[PDB]
Design a protein around this ligand. Structure first.
Ligand code: ZN
Ligand code: ZN
Ligand code: ZN
Ligand code: ZN
Lengths: 814, 81, 62, 62, 814, 81
RNA sequence: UGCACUGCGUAG
RNA sequence: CUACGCAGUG
RNA sequence: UGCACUGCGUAG
RNA sequence: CUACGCAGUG
């Protein structure tokens, strides 16, 4: 029968299942089960859980037991195993010591350690000078890293004498530096990890070192009390008056960071106001049982509850549609989009979803190789730092955030700060960390689901600094055509056809897939967000130094990753994830999507047997992938180039910030050479801590039909000017709901309706070529309603109700 | 020693007034059932209890029998003892 | 159809209720919002009519 | 049952309409009376709900 | 095959079907078809109608074509034959003349005259002295009388020279006396009717003479213009001022009547005010197209429309019933009783139903024999005239009618008039006719049908005079137990059982029947109402003279039969029927019901073959019935007694004012010796001009079950004190609707609800013994609701919710 | 000759004002379509036309096109010519 | 806002 | 028995 | 009452 | 090209 083995030799290499006192199952089996998870085949995981009293068989009778969102209690079950894992780690260290004492040089593999922690392998061990033994633990520890956080192995470290039974350790409330504790934990657990570990990322040599140190800090921080982390503040004298001002920050990932320009003007006033130190100091203590998140303070005497008003209904358009034969009984086209009202507890409830963000430790070698590969997808673009006068702001009448929203909009602050002041603030952010407060606001929009949606309005200072830092690269990405990232590419004037042709480019046996990210903005691991930030900042090689880039990363983390959240007059500490109001929201998520795809491909290739592979080139590629993953430190540029070319040839991706359309080779995916939907599910399981349902994922066998859905648009192949082209059309229900229901009564009727219905007709024209007659009739209904509105209002306006104007919008002339 | 303290702990050890949000009566009995309770290693004595509508709910009214008639969540404001 | 116009009637009833300062009372607003959301998401006509009748009774009470 | 409470709702709606001086207008009163009488004599629940919705819309218009 | 024959001889007698150039059908066939009408067997009638171009075969494809209410157009079809009938009459006279010239003595039968009017019989003719021939035409004319009005034979008399083609006769608008025209019509048509005919009933020898003259006047009046009939008025000088006052009346039945005390005080003031002369003279001309009824004038500048408010709903009782398990889905007990609101045109629309009253001429010999038989049912009672101080008025706070309602209630006028004044008014009514105005008022009550109901409030003077005239007899009837009329007999304390036992008395093979009168109050022929009035007034042999009784009948006719009707500020002329606000409404209708039953029995007995009857006694009874019907003038008291005894033995009737429960012999009804449902249907067809549906009629085979329905109550046989008794119970829906819905909000809640629910529980207690469990649970629900109301209000009151109080109400102790 | 006249004919030959109730427009065209009409062998010229709500309906408004917008029945008041 | 019948409840 | 109120029946 | 992309309409 | 407003997408 099949057991998981991590093998390396000339003939074959990889971590996969093979046909080949001691316990029935080994640690490699557990790692494989938790890293290659398929609900259809969970026999090994179920037997391991049952045998060691993690849970009972009845637990598996319940459906969706594996899902974290549907069944969070699973997190408890896995935790029941964590202690065992911890023990194994300790034993591993002992084993290593013995080898060092015995002058033994060898490689330790997960498949040679039983679940009781005992090591039963004495092969590949070569005698050397006593005291000179140097074991290799890269593969073992790297593969075991993801399991440690999922099972919460180090929980015992939070108890006195590292015993779960005995009480918790009562750390000093004022203590914030745990550097010695981090060194002690690393020495006890990862003693033989030869790579240097820096608890404080301020002393990291490069971006890869920062990722390594942050990965270790993620695991080490779970032990320390939550109150210790956060902004560090001091009481100082300014102008003969006392002020409490932030002078540092404690990051769960980056350790302790101290501002370089601490001392005891408009720039200073904004720095103080944006700082949550004063607000928290002047705020009353708060205990909110409505959420599991940390509560800091309350700035208001009374709590505030916000409600979502119901949508307005347009009787003229609904009556017109009814008279023309729509909304009948049994009709295919129906109203499924509405404005869903919410109670006063909705907003906070939405914040509660941040509970799905969990401390996740990534396979550091895998993450390093994946980031190196991902950097290739962003090589064409150019980036750097720009001055204040080179910054473009689309809208100056937007909210400036808290507390800046009280006094005015973003225009007020942009006008108040001169270019020199903005440059001074940016330079200050290159030397110091400025914590900020982000407000949570309910968004009023159409939806087909009753769930409320929240957006994070960040402070003005963070937006300004991130703009000056990133706008060059962001504009470079948006102006590029034919790349994997398709931000800035219009679907009109044949853009959809161009993108689809680009995706299909040179695939031997093409099929299409598309997947979804459950709770993407909330459940995203902090490590992946830091990796995306580093990828975006890697364009600053010349214009910024190592210290400047690190301080910019720290500012982003303190303003995006674990900032202070303002909700209904109360302050909370965001566990993690990504804010939707960031200057780099779309692009960071695109980087995350590319990283997940590359990780899935890497897992698929290594999980293959290798011996069965009948292609010499693919076997050599797998062997070199394992070499560059678990055996070689320095980045191999040649192999990175080769793997990027391989992925581009057999894995063509179109990514827009959450949505991915992938063209992949039939035979390679069937043989496991290329990632499939199951690989993405496993990756999202052991990395993103979320279960991906096959219902939300789609696979298209035939290219002529096109992608099932992309950006809420479906695709049709239609005949235009003797040439067949791909044309996007929306769901008729969405357009009809937009027409019938409106945000406010101001836009209920009048001239302003003409523009709205013209835009809706522009969007809905492609439905005319759909085989269904009602879909086509939707566009004619919209045109006739535009005619009727013009008549009620009463030559150029003719073009609005003549279909040639909408014909022109989808032709490749422009 | 260093003079640096975490921000989060400042309200905990220095806030004179405490506000607690109670979603249901079960958390009410668990956390602050009586007129005086213990939280953050400090004793807090209740001063006011309002409802979601900003009405002055009395201590006697809070009970299992009358819980359905209360506009939850309940905001309880207390002062440090 | 009766389902679509029932949904529209529920939407307008919730709008007028909100304009009647019903949102001042937390529990009444919660009940009205729940009823309206269920009506919109309802797939059975009879349940939609029952919920619309309940919401209309809420309005008629005041 | 839904039929009986629908009938009762129709009766009370007609009562409040009459108290709203709706009877001053001849045609509106005729329509309301016809709808109410049909609701009372109706044997199909869906038609009763449709007529109740129509009468409630009549009330909501003013 | 079977043809209708009117036969008389020693062996057999009667008008029935027998197995026995010239046309296929004779006049006897038409008379039989129109007098014995069965929708199942209408072949002869259909063939007669089609052959003579009255209508087409397609007319018979339409259902309910025969029904007058559903298809009034049938009246037109029959009219197409009337002219033909008229011709026959003329020819008949000619034939008679010939016989008188030929010295021929014989009996003319309907079966010897073809539908072309030719007489082809020369048998039974015996030669005598020339010029001395005296034909017998009693049977012929008497049997043909009903057809004349239905077919409107004399319509040609309304045209110049008695030709339909030529224009109508333009009579002088001021002309009101048509005595000469009546004599001329009688001489031309009924020349050989030996009995003296008085166009003016003032000169009628007795009640039978009045009936005969009124029957002829009914036919003769259709020719004369409608405007001629009505009150006769004169302009006179009183106190040196001019007044228009009524001094006579023209009755379609009684001819011209002139007041005896015409001259040119409180009594005089009321006589003037009640008189419609002043109101009509001061009223503007009115033309109302909303109805086919005659419009007199409008007393108001603007027309008035009255609406029926909706019923109030009792939320407490409905909620209580719902909580206790009632009004569930599929439950047998449901709410089917409500208050149905009506528009502003409802009241007048109800008045439009008076269109169903038609001029009906009755078989005078049959009516005379039937009234003689009916008088036997009222022999036990005693009646007469009483003084003012002997009059009992139940409620003095009721409406006094128009115009008396303006100034006060009935109490005001009763107090104003002393006993001497009331006696003077009554004596005046014995010498003069006082026309009055009756108001039509919508009644607010529970019903299971959407139709509005109207009541006729008569003037105070008419009520007072009719009370003084009839109250003695009316109270005598109400105080009699064990009689056919069961007015005044309580259903409680075993009264229901006593009545049911009385009905079943001595029936050989008993079955039960019950029938309904469609549009009874509106479609009742005027002749039957006059007959009922004469039957009621026959108790005045000693206290009133012939003139006094005739003038009282004329006053009743001018105040009840064809009075002036006030509707929404407009005056109209009532075509006929009965008013519901009369002092003798219930008793006159009981007389009408008994008359209809006796007529049905007579028709059933005579319609039998006679030869097939194997009983000598029944054959002799039929022969003597024919003798006393169409051959003997003077009333045969012995045969009337024998026939009354026969009906009582084989036809037991329980009559309450519309509702009849009949116990009848099985074999006699099967053999045609006793009337069946079909006989009642035929009688209602050719006399009442309405079609009786078998759905509204019920027949009970078994006596143990009891009558299906009587006074809206059903019957159960239940065990009480070792004795089985008959117990009445109502429909649960009616009681539940009464409990849930109330007239006004004043009785919505409070102490007054206790009495209402106690009465409802008293009515609904019998449902406890019903086999259905919900029916019994209704009473317990009512008792529990009474308990809850008493609790909300908060020893003797215990009896209200204890079931012993309701037990006692249905036991024969009291 | 006798001095006695039927009551019903008194308003017919002596009423100065005539009121006609019109249930529908068909009877309107049949009976009194124009401003002047003939009834009871007399010529009547219209003075006013009100609706069921007692509103002054004008002659022009009465038509087949606008009939559904009228509160029938229509009360037309005319004077003897 | 009608004519009768019946049965209840409160004062005498 | 009388006065008042209520309920049912035609 | 957030960060980006795209497309329209009105003035220059 | 710029200013304002609108619509769709994540
Ligand atoms: Zn480092
Ligand atoms: Zn830079
Ligand atoms: Zn006579
Ligand atoms: Zn008398």
């Amino acid at each position: 029968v099949y057991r998981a083995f991590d093998i390396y030799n000339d003939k074959v290499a990889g971590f996969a299942k093979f046909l080949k006192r001691l316990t029935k199952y080994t640690m490699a089996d557990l790692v494989y089960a938790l890293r290659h998870f398929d609900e259809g085949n969970c026999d090994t995981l179920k037997e391991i859980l049952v045998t060691y009293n993690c849970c009972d068989d009845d637990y598996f009778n319940k459906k969706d037991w594996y899902d974290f969102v549907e069944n969070p209690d699973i997190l408890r079950v896995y935790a029941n195993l964590g202690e065992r894992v911890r023990q194994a780690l300790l034993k591993t260290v002992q084993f290593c010591d013995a080898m060092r004492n015995a002058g033994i040089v060898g490689v330790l593999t997960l498949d040679n350690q039983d679940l009781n922690g005992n090591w039963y392998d004495f092969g590949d061990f070569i005698q050397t000078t006593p005291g000179s033994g140097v074991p290799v633990v890269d593969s073992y520890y790297s593969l075991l890293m993801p399991i440690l956080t999922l099972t919460r192995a180090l929980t015992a470290e939070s108890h006195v004498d590292t015993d779960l039974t005995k009480p918790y350790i009562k750390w000093d409330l004022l203590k914030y530096d745990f550097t010695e504790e981090r060194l002690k934990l690393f020495d006890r657990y990862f003693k033989y990890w030869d790579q240097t570990y820096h608890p404080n990322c301020v002393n990291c040599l490069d971006d890869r070192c920062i990722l390594h140190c942050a990965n270790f800090n993620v695991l080490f921080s779970t032990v320390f009390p939550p109150t210790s982390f956060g902004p560090l503040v001091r009481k100082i004298f300014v102008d003969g008056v006392p002020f409490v001002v932030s002078t540092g920050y404690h990051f769960r990932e980056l350790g302790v960071v101290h501002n370089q320009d601490v001392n005891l003007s408009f720039k200073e006033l904004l720095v103080y106001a944006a700082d949550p130190a004063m607000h928290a100091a002047s705020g009353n203590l708060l205990l909110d049982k409505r959420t599991t998140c940390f509560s800091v303070a309350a700035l208001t005497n009374n709590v505030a509850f916000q409600t979502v008003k119901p949508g307005n209904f347009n009787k003229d358009f609904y009556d017109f549609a009814v008279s023309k034969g729509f909304f009948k009984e049994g009709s295919s086209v129906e109203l499924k989009h509405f404005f869903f009202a919410q109670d006063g507890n909705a907003a906070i409830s939405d914040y509660d979803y941040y509970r799905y963000n969990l401390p996740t430790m990534c396979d550091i070698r895998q993450l390093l190789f994946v980031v190196e590969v991902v950097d290739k997808y962003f090589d064409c673009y150019d980036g750097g730092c720009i001055n204040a006068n080179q910054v473009i702001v689309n809208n100056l009448d937007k909210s400036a955030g808290f507390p800046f929203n009280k006094w005015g909009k973003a225009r007020l602050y942009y006008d108040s700060m001169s270019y020199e002041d903005q440059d001074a603030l940016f330079a200050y952010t290159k030397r110091n960390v400025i914590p900020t407060i982000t407000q949570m606001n309910l968004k009023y929009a159409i939806s087909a689901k009753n769930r409320a949606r929240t957006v994070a309005g960040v402070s003005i200072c963070s937006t300004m600094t991130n703009r000056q830092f990133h706008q060059k690269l962001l504009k470079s990405i948006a102006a590029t055509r034919g790349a994997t990232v398709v931000i800035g590419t219009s679907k009109f004037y044949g853009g959809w056809h161009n993108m689809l042709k680009t995706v299909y480019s040179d695939v031997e046996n093409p099929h299409l897939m598309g997947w979804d990210y459950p709770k993407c903005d909330r459940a995203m691991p902090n490590m992946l967000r830091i990796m995306a930030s580093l990828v975006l900042a890697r364009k600053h090689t010349t214009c910024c130094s190592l210290s400047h880039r690190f301080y910019r990363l720290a500012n982003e983390c303190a303003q995006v990753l674990s900032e202070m959240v303002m909700c209904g007059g109360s302050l909370y500490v965001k566990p993690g994830g990504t804010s939707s109001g960031d200057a780099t929201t779309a692009y960071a998520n695109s980087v995350f999507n590319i990283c997940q795809a590359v990780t899935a491909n890497v897992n698929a290739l290594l999980s293959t047997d290798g011996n069965k592979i009948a292609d010499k080139y693919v076997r050599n590629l797998q062997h070199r992938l394992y070499e560059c993953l678990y055996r070689n430190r320095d980045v191999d540029t040649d192999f990175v180039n080769e793997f990027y070319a391989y992925l581009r040839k057999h894995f063509s991706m179109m990514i827009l910030s959450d949505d991915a359309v992938v063209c992949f080779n039939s035979t390679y995916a069937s043989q496991g050479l290329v990632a499939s939907i199951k690989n993405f599910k496993s990756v999202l399981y052991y990395q993103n801590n979320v279960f991906m349902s096959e219902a939300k994922c789609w696979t298209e066998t035939d290219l002529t039909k096109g992608p099932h859905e992309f950006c809420s648009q479906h695709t049709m192949l239609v005949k235009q000017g003797d040439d067949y082209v791909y044309l996007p059309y929306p769901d008729p229900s969405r357009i009809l709901g937009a027409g019938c229901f409106v945000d406010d009564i101001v836009k209920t009727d009048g001239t302003l309706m003409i523009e709205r219905f013209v835009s809706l007709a522009i969007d809905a024209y492609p439905l005319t070529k759909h085989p269904n007659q009602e879909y086509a009739d939707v566009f004619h209904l919209y045109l006739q309603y535009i005619r009727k509105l013009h008549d009620e209002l009463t030559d150029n306006t003719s073009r609005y109700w003549e279909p040639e104007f909408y014909e022109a919008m989808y032709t490749p002339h422009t | 020693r260093d003079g640096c303290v975490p921000l989060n702990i400042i309200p905990l050890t220095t806030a004179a007034k405490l506000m607690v949000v109670i979603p249901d009566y079960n958390t009410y009995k668990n956390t602050c059932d009586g007129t005086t309770f213990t939280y953050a290693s400090a004793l807090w004595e209740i001063q006011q209890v309002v409802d979601a509508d900003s009405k002055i709910v009395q201590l006697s009214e809070i009970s299992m029998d009358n819980s359905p008639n209360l506009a939850w969540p309940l905001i309880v404001t207390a002062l440090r003892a | 159809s009766k389902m679509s116009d029932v949904k529209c009637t529920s939407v307008v009833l919730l709008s007028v209720l909100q304009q009647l300062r019903v949102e001042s009372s937390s529990k009444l607003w919660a009940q009205c919002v729940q009823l309206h959301n269920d009506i919109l998401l309802a797939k059975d006509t009879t349940e939609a009519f029952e919920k619309m009748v309940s919401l209309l009774s809420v309005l008629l009470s005041m």
